[PDB]
Amino acid sequence: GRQGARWGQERRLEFIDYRLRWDGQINRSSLTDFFGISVPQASLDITEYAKLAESNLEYDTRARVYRATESFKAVFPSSAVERYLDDLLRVAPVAAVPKLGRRLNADIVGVILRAIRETGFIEVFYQSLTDPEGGERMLSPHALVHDGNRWHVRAYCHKRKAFRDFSLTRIKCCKYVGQDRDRADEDYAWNTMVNVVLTPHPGLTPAQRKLIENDFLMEGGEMHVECRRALLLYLLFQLNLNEADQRPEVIQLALKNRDEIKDLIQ
Amino acid sequence: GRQGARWGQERRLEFIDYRLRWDGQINRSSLTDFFGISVPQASLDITEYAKLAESNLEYDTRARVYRATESFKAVFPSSAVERYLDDLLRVAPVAAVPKLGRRLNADIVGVILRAIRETGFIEVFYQSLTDPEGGERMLSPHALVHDGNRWHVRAYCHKRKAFRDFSLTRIKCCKYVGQDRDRADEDYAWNTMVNVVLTPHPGLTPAQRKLIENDFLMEGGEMHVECRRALLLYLLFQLNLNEADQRPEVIQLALKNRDEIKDLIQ
């Protein structure tokens, strides 16, 4: 009722805050288009956003948009994540492809977050298709990493004496067991910044070569992205350059009837 | 201040609501581990959740967890999306791989949502690497589809007289232009349910064959997933079965220095 209305309105205020942060402006008809609300309601939402931050935005009468002011500081922490729009879209017409992969375990994630926050020791049972028997492992983690769909923890392995990555869905048990020293400054790969230069794939026709350079805002046929050395492997996966242990276990399934399901594709 | 505290607490109430929906229970130490709050605060959060739905949960003194009651109905719409935990993790230690892909355009998404809601005509400029020149197109959409990272719109193409998929980042312009008739019941592929049977990949050793069947809860070495015919192609991408037009444009980049960046991988 009222709680459902205040909850729904709060997401629209986060939409406003997001649009101002990333696009620099918002139209009243953006709210009506996106959420299916009336023009009056969109006017109430904009007024409510202004009560939280009176100088975050300003109406431009000629253009008929609200623009982010010079003093704009986002009101909600959610505005900082680029993909938050995807979440707003998914929560407030929309359909999903079936996810084959395993579901993230909130208990294991919580223990790892605690251990990162407190620089703790954790004892895990890690089990992978590369070593099916699995084994217990002693880790000191210092970062939880999002790779599109997949999560992995960056941690110090103590028997092995090196910093490594561990896929969250391959962690079957996770227990906090002690307090450690901070090691983050010894993970050189994690801290070394690499300037990755991308160009349009050789072989593209002139037209698709110019399209891709326009789509990715390249200067002189080049694009620059800063990556930590310990994350290069994950960036290259997006370009489909490698294919191996650190990809999902879903890849290791197979269709019982590959002939019959292929016919059904159109 | 107070607004920041009520906003932060609301995410913890959504965590509670999510855990009850998906895991059936929540521990007080789950809140403290995940959010870094004090035990007293976690007690205040649980009490606040109970005020919204007094019978959604019940404390089990022996196990020391709050369990979802028989009458549990989620309090927040966000609890319905499995991947909402990933969003809570990303908003409230955490790092991200650089996203190479283009950012979702909220204006275009809003026009498409409006057209789906109102069964409208839309006029788009669609531009792809398969046809670089691009072209204007007349579409009547009826679903917005999430495929992990990627979005596409399922729509009726009128010059072509068929239902097709259109990647959202390849839509460069989108305008609502008219009102249409409802066509959803004529999209047979979208409405035809397919029972996809998956098995462990042939060739796996006995150990990794049993691991994967335990990980995906298979009965008799088999797994069943319902897919709409018009979504089979996207399910097969997760198994890496095809590789082509409907994958990201990012795949069509290349590393300027493939030798130097390969050395840096460890």
Residue numbers in the entry:
A (entry chain A), B (entry chain A): 16 to 107, 123 to 273, 276 to 298
Copy out sentences from the published article reporting this entry, exactly as the authors wrote them.
We crystallized and determined a 2.3 Å resolution crystal structure of Pa CapW in a low-pH condition (pH 5.0). The structure reveals that Pa CapW shares the same overall architecture as Sm CapW, forming a homodimer of protomers with wHTH, WYL, and WCX domains. The symmetric arrangement of WYL domains linked by WCX domains is similar to Sm CapW, but in Pa CapW the WYL domains are each rotated ∼10° downward and inward toward the wHTH domains. This motion is accompanied by a slight widening of the groove between the WYL domains’ ligand-binding sites and bordered by the two WCX domains, and also by a rearrangement of the C-termini of each WCX domain. In Pa CapW, this region undergoes a domain swap to fold against the opposite protomer's WCX domain. Finally, we observe that a salt bridge between a conserved arginine in the WYL domain and an aspartate on the WCX domain is broken in the Pa CapW structure, enabling the WCX domain to move out and away from the dimer-related WYL domain. In our structure of Pa CapW, the WYL domains pinch inward by ∼6 Å, positioning the equivalent tryptophan residues (Trp181) and the nearby α5 helices too close to one another to accommodate the α4 helices in their original configuration. As a result, the α4 helix of each CapW protomer rotates downward away from the WYL domains. This change, and the motion of the WYL domains in general, in turn cause a striking ∼70° rotation of each wHTH domain compared to its position in Sm CapW. Whereas the wHTH domains are aligned for cooperative DNA binding in our structure of Sm CapW, in Pa CapW they are completely misaligned and would be unable to bind a contiguous DNA sequence.
